[PDB]
Symmetry: D4
Subunit: 160 residues, 8 copies
């Protein structure tokens, strides 16, 4: 089926993180595509991708990047689609450079930013799912089931 | 018209920031409601607001708060709707971390600290709604084109 | 004996930290209960727990949480009992996200916050004990003995 | 009446912050004393204050200080009573760490940086005292109910 | 004369900072152009500016921006020319990290946060140009000697 | 051939980082020299080096240092040449001490600062190359080729 | 009398801070000199100052600077004398790290950011000199006793 | 010989750091004593130590502490002697809690603070030595020799 979400990431090294978004979208039966695209190192590849996303039928972009992380924000510069950003954890600064580079977007060019690392990738997929669920009742039901099961599965007392 | 976006904020002091979200939704003719809800001072108010938002017809909730800023994450805890979070100016760094570092399973789409984040939460809510509303999508396109076109070429 | 302290924590992964509070309460012969409850993922479970704590005879709640740590503060929102918060250390941000999410509570809803990690859990139990000792002379004596023994046991010179 | 809470602060400049603790205890009719004590400039004053607090009938000590803020932890070092710490505005980040990162064995229950922390230290002290004082417990319940009920529904 | 340095900045609000770069280049008689270019609001403007800079005869680009400050790194992404970056006052700490932490392969020579960084970006651009322009190199030597010589010996 | 770039570093322990600058300069066929010089511990050695750099025919200095990192800034104090600084990652503070000590130079004494760690060393060499390419067409061609190859070699999709 | 402490600072703008060191030394009747020396703008001035300090009869150097604050560490690099460092208000956090994180072999005894650090650098210099000067040691004892005794017991 | 420097530290766990101060003082033939004393956990032991230091013939105190590090500052509260502080690196916050707790002393109560960790301990001993050298010509000569040898021993080029 035609992708409605695009997962893009700056590098192969970002995939250990962004695969969590891929897995969750697949689990919720959301057709999507997964690509490597760098703002800083393949800027023209990014311009092409972002400019044509809407016409290609994408509804949400999930963008993961670390360091001087510009991929989500430059994606958002070229598309009117909602862009969600995932700060990939960095070696020295533990993703704080990633986070501030992504979240502190200027007024007029939004990126909805999630947690540093794998939890953020998962939440970007879940946030994308909640956006798509607004217009897709079957997906809304799947998402409801998924969230309810998460809540129901939290243990009640610790084991030693 | 019936609201399709809810703007909630932790206190009156958050309004200087969150009014920028209100103004933007109004500018794009997105019907919305604007309320004060405190996660810590009015937890039952928040539970009922977030639990009932979808059945009331809301599509997106924009939540802003300062300090430990529990409001956006706790709103997300109780609604299936997309929740967008605005850290209100530790300069909002405490708010930023308590909003953006949400656990896997409970997303808050987080925007910049302060007025720009508030404006952007409204624009992000607009881009979500635009996916299903062609007239709004065109107005949003116009808004974004005007932004780009209006940036001066040189400083005064 | 009926619990007078409740130790609650967001997850099983928080137990490596919060077990230090459990152990200290047991050492001081303070009857308590120990549960997993997440603000973000089991909010209704938390509302139930916090609302009924006082009527169930609890006097102090110790709440441990990491990340966007909301469990102590939301517990405090629903109970008039004193709530002590333990920031659990986080992977990327080393518990700074935990700490600021817990300590920076708005005026009107207190959480007494302890150190990041195991030392904080121990100190939350000790602070709970000092609160209970105000009205419990036998516990006050045990606590006095415990603190005096800590002080007496600090070595006087380093060994190589 | 004889004080059951002691508010101590590192200097006169801390009063702008700590007066919020004083005001709250007075509002709840909790008898208390309010003093300046410097861990580093008046260490013997602090030792004697903290050592003798319990025998003087104090139940809780609220300590506020800025900078390296040694006062709350050193107070806890010398008393068996619960000590609550208020970092006074590095924006109070230095104070926060020197108060909250106390070693195992010597607790300080730490509140928010600034005026809100001071108010909350008094409320936390009140919630401790309420465990043994039903009339105060009812006044505290009233205070918390008024807080919740008084939050506006929408911004002005 | 035709510009050999381009000063670009993210918005009008960056001018209070970046004018210090402008003033310094003028003082050293380095022909330059001074423009507003937004990485996020005018991405095509930036792509065309940076792609064409070398063929237009520019030798160095000085780029300043605040917030997430995408401008200097994205400029470097599209030009082979040296790009120098000025974080504009999170106090410019966000800007600093988004400028200085560029990946291997895409350098931005980063200067101090604020007005001093702007002045220094111009001086650094001057020191680059001086390598090939003896008259400028002598003027730069003079500028640096005057700086050193002019520092007072004692405070007033 | 006579060196046109000088790579200086505070210590042998800085070489694991600064060797990336050395390697890139060699790859681009830029003659250079590589030395250990500490601002804090061999200040007179630094004064000699920096004062004579221009007359020795150097065009760009790359200076790497960690901690209370003063080598780039003190080099810049004594030379009119462009000085590029590389913050070497530090144990406790992860190079933040290095970064702020290098980047926050006073107005009048520039240091062009690159990323913390190896990526910064590589980028200092690349920035030096772009400076030299302004007056050296053959090097400009090599640098163009190198950057184009970097962009062309970025993969398009992640592998699992 | 001939100076036994040198106060040096990076610029005139550091004087608002460093005058507190000057005032304290004067109060304790410690002869001293007060100068501007820039590590980065006047490196030869600093080299000569620090190299010759001991032979000129100085015993302690107090150095204050802001920003990257190279002055205290570079002073220590060239003198065998004790060097005390004052970070001048990134709020002085950059200065603090560039002063305190000196490598093994080249100490700077670092004081608090700002005016309090400056006062304390002078007091620390006084405590060093007092080891060999009984009259000063008594004046310092008096100063410390007056400090302790003068702290108010309660806030106004 | 009678100690003229006292090295005090909060705990045995601080000794891995503070032993570097001990070693350097011994190398420079500076008689000293080495003790464990905690501000937070043995405050009366600290009061006794600090109050009597001057009368016992100590000239300089070196105090090492981690976390909510109060030992140097409380030592300085009770002695007129110069107190040098060494922030011991902490697990979560990498010694930043240690550093700010020690360096940010109020006006009127100085602590001369050195680097986080072992380098700071070494520098506290060296700073103590430079203080003592003011009145001790033989030690001044030893210290001169030591610093000159450090400078002379810095290598000139890196090895691979």
């Amino acid at each position: 089926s035609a992708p409605v979400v695009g997962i893009i990431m700056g590098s192969q090294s970002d995939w250990e993180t962004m695969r969590h978004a891929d897995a969750l979208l697949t689990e919720l039966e959301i057709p999507h595509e997964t690509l490597i695209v760098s703002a800083n190192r393949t800027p023209d590849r990014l311009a092409d991708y972002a400019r044509t996303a809407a016409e290609r039928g994408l509804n949400v972009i999930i963008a993961g990047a670390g360091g001087a992380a510009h991929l989500p924000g430059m994606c958002a510069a070229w598309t009117r689609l909602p862009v969600l950003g995932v700060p990939v954890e960095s070696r020295a600064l533990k993703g704080m450079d990633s986070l501030l580079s992504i979240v502190q977007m200027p007024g007029g060019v939004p990126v909805g930013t999630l947690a540093i690392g794998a939890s953020g990738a998962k939440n970007a997929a879940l946030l994308a799912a909640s956006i798509l669920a607004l217009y897709n009742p079957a997906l809304a039901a799947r998402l409801e089931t998924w969230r309810a099961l998460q809540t129901a599965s939290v243990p009640n007392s610790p084991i030693t």
